[PDB]
């Protein structure tokens, strides 16, 4: 078609709508959106007015983690009894005010020193199940060396999280990032996927944001979305940022981004790669835009 109903109808594809939280915020367990814990979806739609309210973080290679968690389509989480013996658990930040009390991410455990000492953690959580599982951890970058020696009883913090397949190593750097939400520090969030029969081992001398369990990563037909359209109640399957599109005509002009079996976009009147960007990253963005330009031109000529 060339016009849209103007809303994202909730059937037959189940729609989880983040009124103020981005998918990564709900995954990390923002107190702002505690209702999103352990929820499942077929399409996750993010309003452009979303914002963060907990500890100001950043994700190294945010795009792939975002896409992986979106394609998971399931936020089911299992608490795991990690053996944090010589360290103190449940570090609570002031910025993440949950229930009129200082708190932190519901799925992350800020470990600090116990008895003014932080032993070199070496913990094992083997996978004895029959399914692939995903762990998410982080490294906190303090604003000053004082804020590091206060937290972990040693300046030279580092971490290595390894599986039988590969290893990952993170070094934290001390330095005041420009202040956001009156906090100069940083949190960097990573992830590690442990296959069935694999073993997860955490070996850190300090400066760790431990995981409280594992997420159930599964292959699925879910996806990710970014739009400001309201939620409707109709039954048209296709979903577009401008609304919804019944498949009355084999082509459409509403928007390139789409979900479901939908008419193809042309110049003339499930899960996919991104088609809109906020920044300029480089060569990869040019390639992922040129492929869409080529597809649009070829389908324009084929029509």
């Amino acid at each position: 078609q060339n016009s849209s109903i103007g809303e994202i109808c909730d059937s037959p594809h189940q729609i989880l709508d983040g009124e103020n939280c981005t998918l990564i915020d709900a995954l990390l367990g923002d107190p702002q959106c505690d209702g999103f814990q352990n929820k499942k979806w077929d399409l996750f739609v993010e309003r452009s007015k979303a914002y963060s309210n907990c500890y100001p973080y950043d994700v190294p290679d945010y795009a792939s983690l975002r896409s992986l968690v979106a394609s998971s389509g399931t936020l089911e989480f299992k608490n795991e009894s990690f053996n944090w013996t010589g360290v103190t658990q449940n570090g609570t930040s002031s910025a993440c005010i949950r229930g009129s009390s200082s708190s932190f991410f519901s799925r992350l455990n800020w470990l600090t020193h116990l008895n003014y000492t932080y032993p070199a953690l070496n913990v094992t959580m083997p996978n004895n199940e029959q399914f692939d599982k995903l762990y998410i951890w982080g490294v906190h970058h303090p604003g000053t060396d004082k804020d590091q020696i206060f937290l972990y009883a040693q300046s030279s913090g580092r971490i290595t999280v390894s599986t039988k397949r590969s290893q990952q190593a993170v070094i934290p750097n001390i330095g005041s990032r420009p202040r956001i939400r009156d906090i100069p520090s940083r949190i960097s969030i990573y992830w590690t996927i442990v296959k069935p029969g694999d073993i997860l081992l955490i070996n850190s001398t300090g400066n760790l944001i431990a995981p409280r369990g594992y997420f159930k990563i599964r292959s699925g037909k879910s996806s990710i979305m970014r739009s400001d359209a309201p939620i409707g109640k109709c039954k048209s399957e296709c979903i577009t940022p401008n609304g919804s599109i019944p498949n009355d005509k084999p082509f459409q002009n509403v928007n390139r981004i789409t979900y479901g079996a939908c008419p193809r976009y042309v110049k003339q009147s499930f899960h996919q790669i991104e088609k809109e960007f906020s920044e300029v990253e480089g060569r990869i963005q040019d390639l992922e835009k040129y492929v869409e330009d080529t597809k649009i031109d070829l389908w324009s000529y084929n029509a």
Epitope: Y55, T88, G91, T92, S93, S94, A95, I97, S100, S101, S102, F104, W110, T112, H113, N115, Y116, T117, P142, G143, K146, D147, F150, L151, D182, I183, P184, S185
Partner: antibody
Amino acid sequence: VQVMQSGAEARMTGATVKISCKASGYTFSDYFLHWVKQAPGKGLEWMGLVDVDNGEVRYAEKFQGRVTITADTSTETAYLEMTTVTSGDTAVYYCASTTPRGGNPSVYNYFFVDVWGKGTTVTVSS
Amino acid sequence: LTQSSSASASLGSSVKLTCTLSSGHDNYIIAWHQQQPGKAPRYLMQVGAGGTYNKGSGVPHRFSGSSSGADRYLTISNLQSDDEADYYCETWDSKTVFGGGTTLTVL
């Protein structure tokens, strides 16, 4: 940074007293302010710790219940008031500002004092 | 945690102060605060378990800390004139546990 206390005045036995403190020099508004009693000839005795950023108020075993401590977070000040003050409470109450947390999870070290108030003398007459 | 007795020394000499923990704690960090008579106090030091101490802003270099196990020490490199005062040690965070103070005098 600077911490100053409000000038006190003489009170009578059985009346009530009020003490005000404010530091405002730290650029986080997330710092703790202690309360320490010191009668002349005595040592420092802790009575409570106030979180100016939120509603957290702490107490010691000998001052729980009898003493109520508040803090106006909007103006970032801390107040201390007592009921039926006795003649023996003629002393100095000290408010000490801690290192601002700045979002950190308030480990053992963050509750230390580092700057003391100027000090005010509360006197109770017979 | 526990207090210590008062100290005195001649002008130009060196003096030391002590503040000790209970058997239940060995690695706890203490502080050091100074209080002149008829004057408001002034924070001056923090002492750790591993023989290493932390300093605040404006603290003098004339004072140097120490630790030799379950006890913490302060050392005045040199003291002259009307410099003596009281010295206290906070050793906790849940309670601002002061030992009781140590009084310094000249002779």
